[PDB]
Design a protein around this nucleic acid. Structure first.
Ligand SMILES: [Mg+2]
Ligand SMILES: [Mg+2]
Length: 207
DNA sequence: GGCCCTCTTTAGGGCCCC
């Protein structure tokens, strides 16, 4: 291929997972976020690059759903969380992403996530509140690993997709931002690498 | 949390992005 900028029409894939206090991106709090950039080796194989992870303070006036907190087991009132503002978390992620875009020769970043619209809507909403400028992510395009796993593995559930792909998946570590992002990143890389392995990529190898 | 299905309506379990 072999360069990352040539693989997805100049899009720089960044794996994202968020933990929230509900399903409403407009009103519910962002509590946690992890980001994993990708890279290709000289042979053209995809693999994780830089990993970021932040605990996030609920923005002022945010709604908190008890059922959501019960699911992710996150206590926003814990002073020992080490949480930062949405601004600080996303500002650092954007900085690393813009740096990755520049070095790779890509044009823009695209979010890779499982059921990606969820994570995308929450990140865009948080960027709006924090008044962040020059959002390096595509405003509506995403790489949904649920759809990709549907094609590649015939499974749409993250746990099952990883297992089907022959990956390790610990249910005791599941539903945590860093672990979910890492497993999603490996899943996405495996799907992409498998397609190359089967001769589906490059298009000349599609033959 | 709330919609969906059915071995349903005097119910609960699946869903599986929180
Ligand atoms: Mg998730
Ligand atoms: Mg998660």
């Amino acid at each position: 291929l072999t360069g990352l900028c040539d693989r997805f029409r100049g899009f720089y894939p960044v794996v994202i997972d968020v933990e929230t206090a509900g399903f409403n991106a407009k009103t519910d709090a962002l509590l946690e976020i992890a980001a994993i950039t990708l890279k290709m080796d000289e042979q053209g194989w995809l693999m994780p690059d830089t990993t970021l992870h932040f605990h996030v303070e609920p923005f002022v006036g945010a709604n908190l759903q008890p059922e959501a907190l019960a699911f992710n087991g996150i206590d926003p009132n814990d002073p020992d969380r080490g949480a930062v503002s949405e601004y600080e978390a996303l500002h650092e992620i954007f900085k690393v992403v813009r740096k990755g875009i520049k070095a790779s020769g890509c044009n823009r970043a695209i979010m890779v996530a499982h059921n990606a619209n969820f994570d995308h809507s929450f990140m865009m909403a948080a960027a709006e509140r924090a008044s962040l400028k020059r959002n390096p992510f595509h405003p509506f395009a995403t790489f949904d690993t649920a759809a990709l796993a549907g094609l590649a593995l015939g499974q749409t559930v993250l746990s099952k997709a990883c297992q089907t792909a022959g990956m390790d998946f610990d249910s005791t570590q599941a539903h945590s931002a860093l672990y979910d992002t890492e497993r999603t990143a490996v899943l996405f890389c495996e799907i992409v690498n498998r397609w190359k392995r089967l001769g589906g990529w490059p298009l000349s190898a599609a033959e």
